[PDB]
Amino acid sequence: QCVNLTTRTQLPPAYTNSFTRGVYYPDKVFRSSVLHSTQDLFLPFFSNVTWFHVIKRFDNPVLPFNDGVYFASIEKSNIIRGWIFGTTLDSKTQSLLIVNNATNVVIKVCEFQFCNDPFLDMESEFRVYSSANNCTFEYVSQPFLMDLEGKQGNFKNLREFVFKNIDGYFKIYSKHTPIDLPQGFSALEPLVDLPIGINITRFQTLLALHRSSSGWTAGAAAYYVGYLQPRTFLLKYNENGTITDAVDCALD
């Protein structure tokens, strides 16, 4: 429980860029064939995003949360599963646990006592914590099925999650598209709204490993962690209602 993996090796944090993507629907109200000016929390284009590569090489740093982040995951053997949230990440404060046990995605707000490097170890037994008390929020999402079998090769899918905090509200934006750095544009539809309202200053990335502490290895996967700014954009809609392009004002 408390004793983590000592066989890990970390990469230096090199930086990459994102070009045409990161555009979501800002409003629940549908609009057709207009040009709309909205003000919400967005990503300025042609920015610097930190490169991560997981292959005994593992990338799991400790990063703070301030305004907003993105998580853009690209998978093969399904390494990156979910994320843990909280302020000091212990039993002194509330913690948001988003994890999948490969039955349904488990969203609980309780007080868990985290270790230094938690991991997810088919799946046999899931214990990331020593004790649990004072639970608050419970949610049952849509179930999914997957395979935990390790594969190394080309990357056939993309996995998108948006973690943002506006006035205590947490909205999850997801778009599932197939095809190191894929391109094109994406429009992320809203799915799960979380009315939790807790202060989260820090996150950590959970990693699932396959085959006591010696025999666990992992495949090839990558993820992206961005930063956000309250920037004013423009919108574009066709007759079908999908966003092709968005224009950042302060760039060019």
């Binding site: 629940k28 109200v29 549908f30 057709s32 809203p190 079908n240 209602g241």
Partner: peptide, 22 residues
């Protein structure tokens, strides 16, 4: 005949009018 989203509520108009509803 327009393509719709399952999530949405009401569609809009350039003419600033609500032309559709789900």
């Amino acid at each position: 005949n327009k393509k719709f989203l399952p999530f949405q509520q009401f569609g809009r108009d350039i003419a600033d009018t609500t032309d559709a509803v789900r």
